[PDB]
Symmetry: C3
Subunit: 292 residues, 3 copies
């Protein structure tokens, strides 16, 4: 006799200090739970809340469904703002609204949009469509058809995969499955076992890119690092080159075979036997002048 | 006689299983709609919800307004968490809260903040102020005065325009209106018809940057690619250069005229007639040594 | 006698057109405020709203708390969707849900997650864990333990500090405290007084990087710019170098001492006395051929 249920013949209460504002076929269980009205809403557990709408289920302690239809807030401190067929079943999980979204682990959030999944702990999908953040601390800023399965990974745009730890995939069709790698632009792939690779470009060819490679530009291809201590030009040998690195660091690429790029506005580099500064045309000219 | 309306003399119901918790001047229409209380709230259609507040309008099926004032949730599965003068009129559209925000198409989302507009399908504005995402699958992460009119474009910071397809504008005053281009930093412009341009820099001059150009650094200027098959130094001709590309790929720029940059820690490149590897100072020194 | 309070012996109303749907120990003050039910909820001021739950406080005009526990919406047009111990005390501030989140200034937003703080005007934290956006127009896209104290700054991933104006920190452990700088990758530091520095790389050494420096790649180190007008190789002097810039622009770095990187697919640059185009191996070979 502590409950305030009113409205319909089929509104049922099974507990203490429950309230149903009206509508019909609404169930309440537990203690201090509330349904504002609507149709076929279930608010069980302690201190749960359903604003209204239809076929919503707020099981779990301190759950909240603002309204809409077919939403399910399960688990402690869940929140669904509203929308269609949203499922917040993580602790402190949040779905702002939209359709068919899932926030399934502790502190996961979905801002809205459609068919988004925040499945990682502390993962976030701000909005967009068909985005899937699975890694711990992963983020999808928005867009469509992104994946962020990496720990603390970040993805935004269309069809990206930030699918290794600390992966950054920005733009369109960037696939990252190698640790600590970045791809910004379009159509870029960093495969598993290609580590520390950085791409600011589009339509790159990363077949031959070793670990540590940097790729810049449209149509740029990776290349294996070669050790060059010396060279021979028709009997004449040139020895003592600096930067003939033993380690496999990879190479900074600015184009591909047949589609090379000029590097412009380069300052004059040191000319000495230990110098690893790049050389510009005026410096080579200077020497060629003497060869007259 | 299936309705539960109570509270004020001016609360009106026109339908089946409607509920008004209290307050005054609240209207309900349709079936299974609910107003918790407050003032001048309109909940029409089937299964709509208004928590409370004032002058809110939840027309449209399965609409939800949590509270606040002057909010309008129109169209199926709309959600407004609360706030001032928010308009969610897209299907499954969402506005978390804030003031004067608009989510107008299917699956669009506004997290909060002020004067934000998610007008593209699957578009997202997480928050901030005066941000406008118009493209399909476009994203504005936050900040102030951003635009994302491009399909699957991405913008964040202050005063950016990701206004071409797959455009990435990050930081302050990056304007992109050329396809598949990226600008990260400050004060960068990629105009319409400048395609595949990548800028990691600030205050760049892109007047002379052709398609495919890469600009790195503060004050960096673009430059037109030149074909250089050979050169002549005082009667002496040097022929057979590799990388004298016929195609217009653009050029990687690291500075501007008068403010050139050295490129440092460059590994020794191949010295052969097909070599497109960059050359360091020790390599030029090596040859100069022989010229003694 | 304009109020509709029902449910418990300890539900109190002190104002006009207030409503309490049920539960117990709920307080209402002001005009047109509403509590759906629950336990120990306080809805004061004009047009405030509490859906239900426990120990929630909606002071402030047009406030909204959807549900959950221990939430406090203070100040005009505040919104808390639900969750645990959230505090929205800015004008038009928004918290989607989650636990222990704070939106404290005008137009600030927290999408969800845990221990997030939007303390800057127009600031946004989409979600994640322990993120702190303090700057005006600052953004944290998501992830864990980020800071964005800079005006219009942007951070995402794990443990970043976008802590200067227009700072972009993307990935893991990027620290930016220098004006208009960008760090994308892992373990990068831009200190106060290092301006206009751009890093696309990881584990960089920025001790010797001057203003305007660009660092590319894993393990890349900055280097001070040197003026090189001429050089001397065993009595032979080479004068008239172009790009011997007087200004301190900094240098583009591609590696570090002992771990240098080759730059590959470089187009042939102009060979003239004003040429600042980079030189490739085939061009140096061409000259070496003549030295036979």
């Amino acid at each position: 006799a502590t409950n305030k249920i009113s409205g319909g013949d089929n509104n049922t209460a099974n507990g203490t200090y429950l309230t149903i504002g009206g509508g019909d076929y609404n169930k309440t269980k537990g203690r201090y739970s509330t349904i504002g009205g609507g149709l076929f809403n279930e608010a069980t557990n302690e201190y749960s809340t359903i604003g209204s709408g239809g076929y919503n289920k707020a099981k779990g302690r301190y759950s909240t469904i603002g309204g809409g239809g077919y939403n399910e807030a399960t688990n402690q401190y869940s929140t669904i703002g509203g929308g269609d067929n949203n499922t917040a079943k993580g602790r402190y999980s949040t779905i702002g609204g939209g359709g068919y979204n899932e926030a399934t682990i502790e502190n996961s959030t979905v801002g809205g949009g459609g068919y988004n999944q925040a499945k990682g702990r502390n993962s976030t999908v701000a909005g967009g469509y068909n985005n899937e953040a699975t890694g711990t601390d992963s983020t999808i800023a928005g867009g469509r058809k992104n994946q962020a399965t990496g720990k603390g990974s970040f993805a935004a745009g269309i069809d990206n995969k930030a699918n290794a730890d600390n992966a950054v995939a920005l733009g369109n069709k960037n696939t990252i499955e190698g640790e600590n790698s970045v791809a910004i632009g379009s159509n870029n792939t960093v495969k598993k076992g290609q580590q520390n690779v950085f791409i600011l470009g589009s339509n790159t060819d990363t077949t031959n890119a070793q670990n540590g490679s940097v790729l810049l530009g449209h149509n740029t291809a990776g290349k294996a690092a070669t050790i060059v201590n010396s060279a021979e030009v028709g009997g004449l040998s040139l020895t003592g080159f600096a930067g003939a690195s033993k380690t496999g660091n990879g190479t900074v690429s600015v184009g591909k075979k047949g589609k090379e790029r000029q590097i412009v506005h380069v300052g004059a580099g040191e000319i000495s036997d230990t110098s690893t500064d790049a050389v510009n045309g005026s410096q080579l000219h200077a020497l060629a002048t003497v060869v007259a």
